[PDB]
């Protein structure tokens, strides 16, 4: 029943700097001002319900996903390393139409000779708005003092799930137990020449006494009756 997909595209940070202005590696050079060491960037994505108080201490009701080190400084996210893009937060209820989202870009060292790593928060963004179920991506781009993160987000229903909250189930069928498709809200729209609850009954031709339907618009005659309509 539906899923919220957040697809990260590009994180920009050519200077390898921090939320507080300093550099992630912590060492520059005397002249100029550029730094040395780059910024090993991970991400944390928290999706929660719209709770109308814009607070960050509440629980991530949908998910609290942590990303491995994807790149250094500026990163082109639009691969693997165990990470899936887009990130999917599934649900089993009606989509509430509203949501709250936290996305953090983090620095994190990764030297195999250390028993403890060094982490620095690079950027934090909050997205809390009303979102409708649609196959179109909504693209945004958050820009801080040094860093920029571009992403797409949307909610789409799972397979065989129609409706506005992705709750009404419907599967097309074309066998002895039904011949039909589904509409936009999830109603069983039947193929031409079918009828009934699941539309397992064919529709014969104009007339047909004694004759019956094995397939739509046809009539099989019984003993003692000929013609087209099996009169
Ligand atoms: C911190 O560093 C860790 C080590 O990385 C090293 O450091 C730097 C210098 C890198 O440039 C790199 O070159 C170094 O190796 C790093 O650990 C790595 O973590 C990832 C995910 O957390 C692991 O990925 C998994 O890999 C296997 C297969 O990988 C093979 O190929 C690679 C190269 O292509 C080799 O390096 C490996 O040794 C293997 O030979 C995948 O199969 C697996 O996907 C599976 O996911 C689930 C299981 O969880 C299954 O259900 C799926 O079906 C898949 O089978 C992952 O993609 C990677 O192995 C690991 N490296 C090593 C050496 O163990 C870590 O990510 C860095 N960051 C953090 C935050 O820790
Ligand atoms: C890198 O991202 C840009 C979008 O900013 C895209 O045009 C390009 O295709 C990406 N790189 C590759 C190798 O596709
Ligand atoms: C991007 O930022 C917020 C949504 O996070 C919204 O107020 C703004 O209008 C968005 N702009 C575009 C062009 O999507």
Residue numbers in the entry: 23 to 100, 106 to 258
Question: What did the published study say regarding this structure?
Answer:
The β1‐2 loop (blue for Delta, at top) adopts a different conformation in Delta than in Serrate despite conservation of the two stabilizing disulphides; (E) Notch—one copy of EGF11‐13. C Isolated structure of N‐terminal Delta, with residues deleted in ∆β1‐2 highlighted as red Van Der Waals spheres. Purified N‐terminal fragments (NE3 variants) were therefore used to test the liposome‐binding capability of variants in which 5 amino acids were deleted from the β1‐2 loop, hereafter referred to as DeltaΔβ1‐2. This binding was compromised when the variable β1‐2 loop was shortened, resulting in the deletion of residues GATGK; DeltaΔβ1‐2 fragment exhibited a significant reduction in binding when compared to that from DeltaWT. In comparison, the variant with the loop deletion, the DeltaΔβ1‐2 fragment, retained Notch binding as predicted from the fact that the loop is positioned far away from the Notch‐binding interface.
Canonical Notch signalling involves a simple cascade, whereby ligand binding induces successive cleavages to release the Notch intracellular domain (NICD) which translocates to the nucleus and directly regulates gene expression with its binding partners (Kovall, 2008; Kovall & Blacklow, 2010; Bray, 2016; Kovall et al, 2017).
